Design a protein around this ligand. Sequence first.
Ligand code: SF4
Ligand SMILES: [Mg+2]
Ligand SMILES: [Mg+2]
Ligand SMILES: [Mg+2]
Ligand SMILES: [Mg+2]
Ligand SMILES: [Mg+2]
Ligand SMILES: [Mg+2]
Ligand SMILES: [Mg+2]
Ligand SMILES: [Mg+2]
Ligand SMILES: [Mg+2]
Ligand SMILES: [Mg+2]
Ligand SMILES: [Mg+2]
Ligand SMILES: [Mg+2]
Ligand SMILES: [Mg+2]
Ligand SMILES: [Mg+2]
Ligand SMILES: [Mg+2]
Ligand SMILES: [Mg+2]
Ligand SMILES: [Mg+2]
Ligand SMILES: [Mg+2]
Ligand SMILES: [Mg+2]
Ligand SMILES: [Mg+2]
Ligand SMILES: [Mg+2]
Ligand SMILES: [Mg+2]
Ligand SMILES: [Mg+2]
Ligand SMILES: [Mg+2]
Ligand SMILES: [Mg+2]
Ligand SMILES: [Mg+2]
Ligand SMILES: [Mg+2]
Ligand SMILES: [Mg+2]
Ligand SMILES: [Mg+2]
Ligand SMILES: [Mg+2]
Ligand SMILES: [Mg+2]
Ligand SMILES: [Mg+2]
Ligand SMILES: [Mg+2]
Ligand SMILES: [Mg+2]
Ligand SMILES: [Mg+2]
Ligand SMILES: [Mg+2]
Ligand SMILES: [Mg+2]
Ligand SMILES: [Mg+2]
Ligand SMILES: [Mg+2]
Ligand SMILES: [Mg+2]
Ligand SMILES: [Mg+2]
Ligand SMILES: [Mg+2]
Ligand SMILES: [Mg+2]
Ligand SMILES: [Mg+2]
Ligand SMILES: [Mg+2]
Ligand SMILES: [Mg+2]
Ligand SMILES: [Mg+2]
Ligand SMILES: [Mg+2]
Ligand SMILES: [Mg+2]
Ligand SMILES: [Mg+2]
Ligand SMILES: [Mg+2]
Ligand SMILES: [Mg+2]
Ligand SMILES: [Mg+2]
Ligand SMILES: [Mg+2]
Ligand SMILES: [Mg+2]
Ligand SMILES: [Mg+2]
Ligand SMILES: [Mg+2]
Ligand SMILES: [Mg+2]
Ligand SMILES: [Mg+2]
Ligand SMILES: [Mg+2]
Ligand SMILES: [Mg+2]
Ligand SMILES: [Mg+2]
Ligand SMILES: [Mg+2]
Ligand SMILES: [Mg+2]
Ligand SMILES: [Mg+2]
Ligand SMILES: [Mg+2]
Ligand SMILES: [Mg+2]
Ligand SMILES: [Mg+2]
Ligand SMILES: [Mg+2]
Ligand SMILES: [Mg+2]
Ligand SMILES: [Mg+2]
Ligand SMILES: [Mg+2]
Ligand SMILES: [Mg+2]
Ligand SMILES: [Mg+2]
Ligand SMILES: [Mg+2]
Ligand SMILES: [Mg+2]
Ligand SMILES: [Mg+2]
Ligand SMILES: [Mg+2]
Ligand SMILES: [Mg+2]
Ligand SMILES: [Mg+2]
Ligand SMILES: [Mg+2]
Ligand SMILES: [Mg+2]
Ligand SMILES: [Mg+2]
Ligand SMILES: [Mg+2]
Ligand SMILES: [Mg+2]
Ligand SMILES: [Mg+2]
Ligand SMILES: [Mg+2]
Ligand SMILES: [Mg+2]
Ligand SMILES: [Mg+2]
Ligand SMILES: [Mg+2]
Ligand SMILES: [Mg+2]
Ligand SMILES: [Mg+2]
Ligand SMILES: [Mg+2]
Ligand SMILES: [Mg+2]
Ligand SMILES: [Mg+2]
Ligand SMILES: [Mg+2]
Ligand SMILES: [Mg+2]
Ligand SMILES: [Mg+2]
Ligand SMILES: [Mg+2]
Ligand SMILES: [Mg+2]
Ligand SMILES: [Mg+2]
Ligand SMILES: [Mg+2]
Ligand SMILES: [Mg+2]
Ligand SMILES: [Mg+2]
Ligand SMILES: [Mg+2]
Ligand SMILES: [Mg+2]
Ligand SMILES: [Mg+2]
Ligand SMILES: [Mg+2]
Ligand SMILES: [Mg+2]
Ligand SMILES: [Mg+2]
Ligand SMILES: [Mg+2]
Ligand SMILES: [Mg+2]
Ligand SMILES: [Mg+2]
Lengths: 82, 99, 61, 208, 96
Amino acid sequence: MVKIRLARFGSKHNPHYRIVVTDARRKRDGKYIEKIGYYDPRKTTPDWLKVDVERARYWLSVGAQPTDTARRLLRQAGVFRQ
Amino acid sequence: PKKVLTGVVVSDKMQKTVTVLVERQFPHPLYGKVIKRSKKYLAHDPEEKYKLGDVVEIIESRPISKRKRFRVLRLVESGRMDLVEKYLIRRQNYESLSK
Amino acid sequence: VTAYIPGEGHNLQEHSVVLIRGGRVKDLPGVRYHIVRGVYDAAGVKDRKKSRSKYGTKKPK
Amino acid sequence: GRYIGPVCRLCRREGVKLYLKGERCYSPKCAMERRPYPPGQHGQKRARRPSDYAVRLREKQKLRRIYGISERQFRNLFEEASKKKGVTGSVFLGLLESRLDNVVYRLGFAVSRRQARQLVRHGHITVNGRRVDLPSYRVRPGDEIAVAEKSRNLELIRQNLEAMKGRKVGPWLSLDVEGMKGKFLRLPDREDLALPVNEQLVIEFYSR
Amino acid sequence: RNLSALKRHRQSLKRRLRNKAKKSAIKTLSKKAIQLAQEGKAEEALKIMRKAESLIDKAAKGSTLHKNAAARRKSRLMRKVRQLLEAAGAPLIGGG
RNA sequence: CCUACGGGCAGGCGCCGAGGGUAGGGCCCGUGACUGGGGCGAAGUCGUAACAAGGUAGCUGUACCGGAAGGUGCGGCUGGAU
RNA sequence: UUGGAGAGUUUGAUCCUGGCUCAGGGUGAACGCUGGCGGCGUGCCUAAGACAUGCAAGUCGUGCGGGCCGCGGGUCCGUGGUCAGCGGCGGACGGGUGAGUAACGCGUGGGUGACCUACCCGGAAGAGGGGGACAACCCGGGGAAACUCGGGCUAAUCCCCCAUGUGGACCCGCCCCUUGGGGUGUGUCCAAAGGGCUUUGCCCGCUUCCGGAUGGGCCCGCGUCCCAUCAGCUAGUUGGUGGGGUAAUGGCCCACCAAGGCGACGACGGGUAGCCGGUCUGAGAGGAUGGCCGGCCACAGGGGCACUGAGACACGGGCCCCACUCCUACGGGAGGCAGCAGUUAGGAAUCUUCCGCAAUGGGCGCAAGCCUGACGGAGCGACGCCGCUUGGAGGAAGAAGCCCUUCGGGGUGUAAACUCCUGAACCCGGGACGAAACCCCCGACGAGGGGACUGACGGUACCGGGGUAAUAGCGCCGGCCAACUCCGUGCCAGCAGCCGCGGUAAUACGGAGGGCGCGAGCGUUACCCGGAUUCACUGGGCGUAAAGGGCGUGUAGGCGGCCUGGGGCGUCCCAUGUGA
Ligand code: SF4
Ligand SMILES: [Mg+2]
Ligand SMILES: [Mg+2]
Ligand SMILES: [Mg+2]
Ligand SMILES: [Mg+2]
Ligand SMILES: [Mg+2]
Ligand SMILES: [Mg+2]
Ligand SMILES: [Mg+2]
Ligand SMILES: [Mg+2]
Ligand SMILES: [Mg+2]
Ligand SMILES: [Mg+2]
Ligand SMILES: [Mg+2]
Ligand SMILES: [Mg+2]
Ligand SMILES: [Mg+2]
Ligand SMILES: [Mg+2]
Ligand SMILES: [Mg+2]
Ligand SMILES: [Mg+2]
Ligand SMILES: [Mg+2]
Ligand SMILES: [Mg+2]
Ligand SMILES: [Mg+2]
Ligand SMILES: [Mg+2]
Ligand SMILES: [Mg+2]
Ligand SMILES: [Mg+2]
Ligand SMILES: [Mg+2]
Ligand SMILES: [Mg+2]
Ligand SMILES: [Mg+2]
Ligand SMILES: [Mg+2]
Ligand SMILES: [Mg+2]
Ligand SMILES: [Mg+2]
Ligand SMILES: [Mg+2]
Ligand SMILES: [Mg+2]
Ligand SMILES: [Mg+2]
Ligand SMILES: [Mg+2]
Ligand SMILES: [Mg+2]
Ligand SMILES: [Mg+2]
Ligand SMILES: [Mg+2]
Ligand SMILES: [Mg+2]
Ligand SMILES: [Mg+2]
Ligand SMILES: [Mg+2]
Ligand SMILES: [Mg+2]
Ligand SMILES: [Mg+2]
Ligand SMILES: [Mg+2]
Ligand SMILES: [Mg+2]
Ligand SMILES: [Mg+2]
Ligand SMILES: [Mg+2]
Ligand SMILES: [Mg+2]
Ligand SMILES: [Mg+2]
Ligand SMILES: [Mg+2]
Ligand SMILES: [Mg+2]
Ligand SMILES: [Mg+2]
Ligand SMILES: [Mg+2]
Ligand SMILES: [Mg+2]
Ligand SMILES: [Mg+2]
Ligand SMILES: [Mg+2]
Ligand SMILES: [Mg+2]
Ligand SMILES: [Mg+2]
Ligand SMILES: [Mg+2]
Ligand SMILES: [Mg+2]
Ligand SMILES: [Mg+2]
Ligand SMILES: [Mg+2]
Ligand SMILES: [Mg+2]
Ligand SMILES: [Mg+2]
Ligand SMILES: [Mg+2]
Ligand SMILES: [Mg+2]
Ligand SMILES: [Mg+2]
Ligand SMILES: [Mg+2]
Ligand SMILES: [Mg+2]
Ligand SMILES: [Mg+2]
Ligand SMILES: [Mg+2]
Ligand SMILES: [Mg+2]
Ligand SMILES: [Mg+2]
Ligand SMILES: [Mg+2]
Ligand SMILES: [Mg+2]
Ligand SMILES: [Mg+2]
Ligand SMILES: [Mg+2]
Ligand SMILES: [Mg+2]
Ligand SMILES: [Mg+2]
Ligand SMILES: [Mg+2]
Ligand SMILES: [Mg+2]
Ligand SMILES: [Mg+2]
Ligand SMILES: [Mg+2]
Ligand SMILES: [Mg+2]
Ligand SMILES: [Mg+2]
Ligand SMILES: [Mg+2]
Ligand SMILES: [Mg+2]
Ligand SMILES: [Mg+2]
Ligand SMILES: [Mg+2]
Ligand SMILES: [Mg+2]
Ligand SMILES: [Mg+2]
Ligand SMILES: [Mg+2]
Ligand SMILES: [Mg+2]
Ligand SMILES: [Mg+2]
Ligand SMILES: [Mg+2]
Ligand SMILES: [Mg+2]
Ligand SMILES: [Mg+2]
Ligand SMILES: [Mg+2]
Ligand SMILES: [Mg+2]
Ligand SMILES: [Mg+2]
Ligand SMILES: [Mg+2]
Ligand SMILES: [Mg+2]
Ligand SMILES: [Mg+2]
Ligand SMILES: [Mg+2]
Ligand SMILES: [Mg+2]
Ligand SMILES: [Mg+2]
Ligand SMILES: [Mg+2]
Ligand SMILES: [Mg+2]
Ligand SMILES: [Mg+2]
Ligand SMILES: [Mg+2]
Ligand SMILES: [Mg+2]
Ligand SMILES: [Mg+2]
Ligand SMILES: [Mg+2]
Ligand SMILES: [Mg+2]
Ligand SMILES: [Mg+2]
Ligand SMILES: [Mg+2]
């Protein structure tokens, strides 16, 4: 399928994910279809998560499936509150 | 779009095919000047209706044969044998360039 | 090829294994490369004090 | 590491008194006051006309030796200036100044920059709260450059702070003395310090 | 020194067999049909032609023939049957 | 042999085919008794052709000659002193 | 308008020309002398030479039937596990390397009415009745092993037939369309698989079809290195008809027909090279370059081939030829590190046979969970950049030693000594972020709320407390170019990037003192750009410096007078898409 997940950027002991819609079989840090927000697990900032919720639902509509730990950072971003 | 080009038929000697000589100007990347380059296309003529002299349009088309990727769009103008002779002599002129 | 042996006095003989580097000797035509002292069977200059890295000579106490 | 060697000779070569020593610099025991001629066996000789190259070297070394800074870190700063907006000398001087260790000695907590580092280093300084033991820290407008509380009560800093009650220091700076805290209010206009150095010349040394 | 990559292979052998088999079958029948319609013999060619068309399409179902192939195999089949019969005529079945 | 029997599988023949072999060519690199000049050295031998009217103005294309630089013919150029 | 420096050297002297040379930046570097720390990078550029051992791709009992062991305990049935098998889906991703390739390979923009797409999503319909095989297992024969042949048994989501036909496929006709696009009428043809629980209902599954999305296949325009001392190339060649083949166009393949296609706008040939995003340099224009990261391509010991499949002509799948290698019981058989480590060879030279699935991501699975040398980290290497250290304040008209000395003194030098202040290291205690999902609860398995588990790195970072004055090296000092004196040597030994130094007063050799430049680094060699307006578009030239063709005639080509009009190709403007 086409998927929705965490493409690590940043650097050693400095994680910094981009949440991306990528082709399931792309490499993790690879060419993505579209960037839709980021995420910093170390939490060291005002906003360590923005999530284009309008987009994230498009992809969700049109088929995409998020990871486990990407579903949450979309729950946490209120993408499911109906 | 399907690329369309404009050129002269310089060879009718194939069956259901003609050679259309497209030209272009484009200024030279470094030296500035506008310069000319031309190219031959094997163009598809299902009705063997185009002739020498015929200045025509051809269109990027689904592949007909190895080397024919264009069908002749429309006649634009007949009788520019003055062109055919341009090319033709250049070709002829080559016999002298051997050793 | 043929290579210059820099420094005062050398322990080089036939069969001595040697490392070379670029750089001629203006005055010896044909010598266009230099032997690196202190590498393989070419030893450094015993007793240099000044500019030693260039003559492969270790530092004295 | 940094320069860490005979330090009087620097002035003696550079021809001017650079106040690298803190206290001694004002006594007539100061190297310069006793011998105002260059280091070594040949200082006493009738010096020859210095080449344009000579000229600009010394002038840079001067400006450098002043902050006792490594040629790299010096160069980078110059480069940081050459990129940056405005007039290069300003920004070079300006940037140079915003180095904590300097900013520590500026607000006087130390007698030498050379001593001010050791402080900055050994953790005895801080900025807007948190401790900062890196001398290269780029101090920026707004910063509160306290003394480490657990260093307020120290002989070496006691002495230094006290000779600072009524000292006027920098149109670009402030000092709640006695509380041992200061403020970086702005990067200097050139006016704001008159270090014995034509910094235009430094630009020119690098543009070679 | 091993795998169930072998397993995956063992199957290929057997699957292969099924394919090749069903595939030749087509050719025999399909062409037998083109044969008849040549010497047509109209009615029969159409009888056979169907038993082809079913097998062609029954391949189509699985991993044997691809869909468009069955389609391809079909188009060319019918055209041959018809145009052959059309040089004598006429059909005693369909289609069509 | 299966039957699923107007069929399938085995199996047989053919095309093409990795390559192998036979023959003959094209290019390129390496090398070779011997050989031709070339650069360099220089501390030698022979003369002194060119730079002065360079001691026969010089240079020249060509041809013939001579230990060597060179010479001479024929024509040309002045980039020749007087 | 954020951008532009030059110098040495042809002479007795000059100006000009012109080459050589240096200072600048750079690197996957390597060599020397020296070497304390930390972080982030980075590290076989050579033999796409050869490789021992291990490890790199599997998983599902919620598809099926069995074997061995065990927990329930009346041959049996349950439950668990475990071993293979049959059946799945994965294995075509991920990882590696740069051999080949001057090509639609790549880049850029486009075409596809000539196309495909597993798992995902949306939606329309649906799953009735039979029938059969093959392993595992049992039985025999072969071997040292690799294993294997024969015979009989049986389940299934394995196979096959009939039925149903929303639908879809195909021939013919017709309407819209206009390359094979969409609709339709007649004929014809094709579907299916069950499993589990809480068992009048869910859920994972299965089937035909439409659309989406996603990844592709194929096609065309423009760009893409050196040699013309490679000038002529071409028989599947170029076009056509018919077929075969494919997902699909196509001489991709075949038969026949025609005589065509290509080339100085450089065909053909030879040489070199994976291409771009970028990178280095440069005032810019340019030049150079493709390591790391990202995108595409190509290969998987050398070759050919196809099988299975949605997709491979498949690195750790198959067949066959070659080459090498091993194994052994001498009969026979086994291998493919350009995966991670690692060995060897080669080389100037490039690392641990580490740790873990905690994260992230991938495969299977309802889930639990299993696998994951992808990956997260750790290890080694000053390889690069960056940060930190070897202390700080005081301290003589100034010790000893050593250097010079006009013999009075000058120098190293506040340097040392010595004084006090701090406190890298080490000791001690505390000790993370990275981890909240999957799950369980309630809600409805949704929204939502609630609870819980889990850390390789790592007892590390860092917080706190106690605490020691604690590594310096290297180049250079004639001019360019910043830094000068003694001694020894005597055209020797040696130096040398260029000019040039040495023939007993050498700032140029060697040591010394002193000095300049950098500093856990400094220097060297190699290469790239720069200086080089020294291939000159920007931005050069040709009387004598290098350079006008011996002169005509002329093909192609480049260029072209005054006026008016059409077109609007160059050119110019705006919008818009693309420029990851
Ligand atoms: S004393 Fe005079 S010379 Fe010595 S350091 Fe202080 S100022 Fe410079
Ligand atoms: Mg055709
Ligand atoms: Mg020996
Ligand atoms: Mg050199
Ligand atoms: Mg030297
Ligand atoms: Mg000052
Ligand atoms: Mg000052
Ligand atoms: Mg000046
Ligand atoms: Mg500026
Ligand atoms: Mg399996
Ligand atoms: Mg048959
Ligand atoms: Mg198939
Ligand atoms: Mg199919
Ligand atoms: Mg057969
Ligand atoms: Mg053959
Ligand atoms: Mg052959
Ligand atoms: Mg053979
Ligand atoms: Mg010879
Ligand atoms: Mg010879
Ligand atoms: Mg003469
Ligand atoms: Mg004479
Ligand atoms: Mg004479
Ligand atoms: Mg003559
Ligand atoms: Mg004689
Ligand atoms: Mg004679
Ligand atoms: Mg004449
Ligand atoms: Mg400008
Ligand atoms: Mg310059
Ligand atoms: Mg000279
Ligand atoms: Mg001269
Ligand atoms: Mg001279
Ligand atoms: Mg010059
Ligand atoms: Mg510069
Ligand atoms: Mg350099
Ligand atoms: Mg080294
Ligand atoms: Mg060492
Ligand atoms: Mg390699
Ligand atoms: Mg080899
Ligand atoms: Mg070998
Ligand atoms: Mg394992
Ligand atoms: Mg299931
Ligand atoms: Mg299990
Ligand atoms: Mg199993
Ligand atoms: Mg594989
Ligand atoms: Mg792969
Ligand atoms: Mg890959
Ligand atoms: Mg390559
Ligand atoms: Mg080629
Ligand atoms: Mg192209
Ligand atoms: Mg393209
Ligand atoms: Mg059944
Ligand atoms: Mg049964
Ligand atoms: Mg049916
Ligand atoms: Mg055709
Ligand atoms: Mg295929
Ligand atoms: Mg062909
Ligand atoms: Mg043929
Ligand atoms: Mg062309
Ligand atoms: Mg050319
Ligand atoms: Mg090659
Ligand atoms: Mg290559
Ligand atoms: Mg330039
Ligand atoms: Mg240039
Ligand atoms: Mg390249
Ligand atoms: Mg490289
Ligand atoms: Mg790459
Ligand atoms: Mg190959
Ligand atoms: Mg190999
Ligand atoms: Mg092979
Ligand atoms: Mg192969
Ligand atoms: Mg499959
Ligand atoms: Mg293979
Ligand atoms: Mg492949
Ligand atoms: Mg392998
Ligand atoms: Mg073996
Ligand atoms: Mg045996
Ligand atoms: Mg065998
Ligand atoms: Mg092996
Ligand atoms: Mg190794
Ligand atoms: Mg080795
Ligand atoms: Mg070796
Ligand atoms: Mg590594
Ligand atoms: Mg995991
Ligand atoms: Mg996971
Ligand atoms: Mg799943
Ligand atoms: Mg495993
Ligand atoms: Mg492991
Ligand atoms: Mg790693
Ligand atoms: Mg005194
Ligand atoms: Mg003194
Ligand atoms: Mg003394
Ligand atoms: Mg004295
Ligand atoms: Mg001191
Ligand atoms: Mg945590
Ligand atoms: Mg130096
Ligand atoms: Mg310099
Ligand atoms: Mg000087
Ligand atoms: Mg001697
Ligand atoms: Mg002397
Ligand atoms: Mg020197
Ligand atoms: Mg000397
Ligand atoms: Mg450093
Ligand atoms: Mg270096
Ligand atoms: Mg250069
Ligand atoms: Mg020009
Ligand atoms: Mg010139
Ligand atoms: Mg003339
Ligand atoms: Mg003329
Ligand atoms: Mg003309
Ligand atoms: Mg014209
Ligand atoms: Mg005009
Ligand atoms: Mg006009
Ligand atoms: Mg226009
Ligand atoms: Mg644009």
